[PDB]
Design a protein around this nucleic acid. Structure first.
Length: 141
RNA sequence: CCAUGUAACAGCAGUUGAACAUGGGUCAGUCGGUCCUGAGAGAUGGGCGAGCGCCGUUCGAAGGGACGGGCGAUGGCCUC
């Protein structure tokens, strides 16, 4: 099933290295999280088939500060947007190094040395893999 | 000059160059200039000259500077 897709996706825009798969599924758990509430059929203890973001008839008085132990869709979105804003701010940090052609007098370019200077996959995976390797070892043992 | 890089020129050639291109390099109280006048040049006074000017350089009321004393220095209020 996936062997055929392995070689074809690389050609073109450049959505290869399997990272295009990771972003699609990772963002999916974030974006379809909102759409889960209207489509959720399980209730547990409170009605959910009609959604929980707007439930004024069910609650109301109305306790807007509900228990966010399941479907925290109301509160986690508040905190996550803060993380999105802070990361992009630190993403733009870089030290610009003056650079010029060794033959032509004129335009000056800058070699950018990013603050991270390493793609997130090489750094975070090396810490993600060891965390996964630790867990599987303890589960087996 | 230094480094790096590389058709015309280096009366052959060049992978080389005092060539071409890009970019760097010369740090002073103590080494010089700056100060002195030397042969000399040249203002002012004066004279000459139609005149721009030039002759003259010692041939004119050419000192503007001195610690010391009083009015007033009073200023710090009088040490200097």
């Amino acid at each position: 099933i996936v062997l055929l897709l392995d070689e074809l996706l690389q050609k073109g825009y450049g959505l290869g290295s399997g990272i295009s798969l990771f972003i699609a599924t990772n963002i999916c758990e974030t974006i379809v999280w909102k759409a889960f509430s209207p489509t959720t059929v399980n209730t547990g203890r409170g009605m959910e088939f009609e959604g929980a973001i707007i439930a004024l008839f069910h609650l109301l008085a109305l306790r807007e500060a509900f228990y966010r132990q399941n479907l925290p869709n109301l509160m986690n979105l508040i905190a996550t947007i803060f993380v999105f804003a802070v990361v992009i701010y630190f993403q733009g940090f870089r030290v610009d190094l003056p650079i010029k052609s060794a033959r032509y007098r004129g335009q000056y370019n800058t070699y950018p040395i990013k603050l991270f200077y390493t793609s997130n996959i090489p750094i975070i995976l090396q810490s993600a893999l060891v965390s996964n390797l630790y867990v599987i070892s303890q589960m087996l043992s």
